[PDB]
Design a protein around this nucleic acid. Sequence first.
RNA 1: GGGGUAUCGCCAAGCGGUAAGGCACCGGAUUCUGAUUCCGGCAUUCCGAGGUUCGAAUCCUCGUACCCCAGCCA
Length: 529
Amino acid sequence: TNFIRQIIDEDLASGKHTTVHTRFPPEPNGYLHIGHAKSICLNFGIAQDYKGQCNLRFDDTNPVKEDIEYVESIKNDVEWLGFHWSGNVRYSSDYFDQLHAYAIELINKGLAYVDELTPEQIREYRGTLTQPGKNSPYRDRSVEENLALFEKMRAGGFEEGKACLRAKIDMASPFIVMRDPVLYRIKFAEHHQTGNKWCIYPMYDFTHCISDALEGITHSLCTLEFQDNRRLYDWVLDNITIPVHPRQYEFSRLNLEYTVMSKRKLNLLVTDKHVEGWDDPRMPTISGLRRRGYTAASIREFCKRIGVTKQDNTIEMASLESCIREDLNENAPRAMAVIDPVKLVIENYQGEGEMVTMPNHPNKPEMGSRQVPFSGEIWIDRADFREEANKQYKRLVLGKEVRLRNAYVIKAERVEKDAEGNITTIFCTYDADTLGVIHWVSAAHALPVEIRLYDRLFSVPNPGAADDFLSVINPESLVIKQGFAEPSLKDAVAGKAFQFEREGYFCLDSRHSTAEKPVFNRTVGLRDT
RNA sequence: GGGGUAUCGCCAAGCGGUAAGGCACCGGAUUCUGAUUCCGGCAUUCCGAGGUUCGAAUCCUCGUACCCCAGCCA
Ligand SMILES: Nc1ncnc2c1ncn2[C@@H]1O[C@H](COP(=O)(O)OP(=O)(O)OP(=O)(O)O)[C@@H](O)[C@H]1O
C-alpha cells in the first residue's frame, strides 16, 4: 500500500468508481529505463491487483523528437517485465481528429484564439515567476476570425512559428501554465504514425487530459513536475463536451545513485558513442539491464521495495544489486571460471585426468549435479596465490595447503617467476585422499572465455548535477578480461545466469559471443567482505 | 509569485495511545564459495521553536531547508 492505493480504496468504497483504469503513457523519444519501470509497475500493478485495466498509450504529439524504433522497443520492454496492456496499443495520434474538433469547440466558446506573437515574443509577454504577464494584441479576435486563421494553420498557410492556437485563460495567473497555454503549433514534419496528414500538432497539456477522458482512465498517475499542469488538465476537461473527468495524482520520480535517467543525457551517451548503444550493459535502460543479466522479477521486486510516495528520493545502487543477488542466489546454477589465470601444475599428479562431481547448487541438491574434469595442470586466479600472507588470508600461500573447490587439498611448494618478477607457474603437491577453498579450471579441458567486468558508469553519486556529466564518466566501467571457464559452459545460452563461484553472477552476452569465443557479462559481483 | 516535501547513512510505515519493514553497517554461530543461512545489535524520538492534550511524528501556531514552474518539449 501507498497513498495512491489508499485513494483508490476510498474511491471504490464511496462508490465514486466501480473499476480502476490506469495507463502508462511514454513518449517514443528514447528507450525505457528503470525510472519508467517504476511507473509501469505502479500503473499495471494497480490494474491487475484491482482487476481493472491498464492501457499502453504512446504519447506521440511531437514528431521531430520521436521515431518508430522507439515504439517497437517500448512494447518489447513492457512485455519483458511481465505486463500486458488493455486492448490494442493506443496512440495520442489516434485522437488527432478528435483533438482538432475539441480545439474548434474552444474557439466557438471564445476560450481559444490564434496568436501571432513570434516564439520570442510569447516569452516576453508571459511575465516571470514574480511578475504577471500581459495580453497579446491578437487576444480579442472574433470567433469567426480564429476559425478562419486556425483552418489556415491546418491547411499549411502559415510558416512554423508564425502562428499558434492559445487557450484564453489568465495572463496574470500565479500558475505560469495557465497564462494562455499553447494548444497547437506548426510543424511541417512527417509523423511516424500519421505521415504527412497533419502539419499542426497538439501540445501535451491539451492532448493528455482529453486522451485520458476518451479512454475512460479513472486515475491518471504521473510524476511531481505535473502538479502545476493539473490545473490546465482540469480547465480543458471543464470547458469541452466530454462526459468524464479523470483525476491526476502525482508521485515522486526515481533517481538512482551513480547514473542519469534523463533521456537527453542517455541519448548523448549513445550518440557520442561513449556506450555501445541504448542497451549497453552499463545503461540504466530496461534493455541494458536485461543484457547485463537482470531478471524482470528482480526489477519488479525493486519497484516494490522503493515504494510510491511524494518524497524526492535517490536510491543507492546497493538496493538494486540486493534485488538481483537475491533472485540469482536462488535460481542460478554454479560453475567454475577463472578471470585472471596463472598456471598451477601438480608435480605429484599421475595420469591424464579424472572426473570429479560438482553441485549445480551447493544448498539445493534437487538442481542436480555434473561431472567436471580434474587434471595435474589447472588454472587458478592470481589473487588466490599469495607468496607471503597474514592469518586473515585463507587462500593459497607458498607454505601451506588449500582445498580446491569440490576436489583435492593441494599444497604450495615452489613458485617459478619469469624475468620481470611476475609469477608464471606455481608448483604444488596434492594429497591423493582429501575427499579456505579456491576455484579452479583444468587447463587441458578449459574453454577460452571473454569476461566483461562492469562497474558504475559514473564516478560521482549524482552525475546529473555535474556541469559536464560526460567528463565524470568512470574510465573503469568496463574492463575486458580473457579467462578460462569449465567445459560445461559450452552449452550456456543467452539470458541464463550462472554463478561463477567466488566471483559473481554472469551471463552470456548476446551481441559479442560466438562459439569460437563466448563472452560473459558480469551482472553483479558477490558480496565481498 | 505559485505549487509541493520534511521520520535512521539510503528508502519507508505511521492518520491522538508510547517510533514497523527493507537496503547498508557492526558483531557472533554454522558452511568445501570471505557467498548463502541463523542469531543479535542498530530512531527515549520524527526539520526547529513554542502551544493544546492524561497522552503529539500525528492537532495548532510561527519559523527554516530543499524540490518543481517563465518550450510553439513531455
Ligand atoms: N525517473 C522516473 N521515475 C518515475 N516515473 C518516471 C520517471 N521518468 C519518467 N517517468 C514516468 O513515465 C511516463 C513516461 O515518461 P516519458 O516517456 O514521457 O519520458 P520522460 O522521462 O518523462 O521525458 P524525457 O523523454 O524527456 O526524458 C510518465 O508518466 C513519467 O512521469
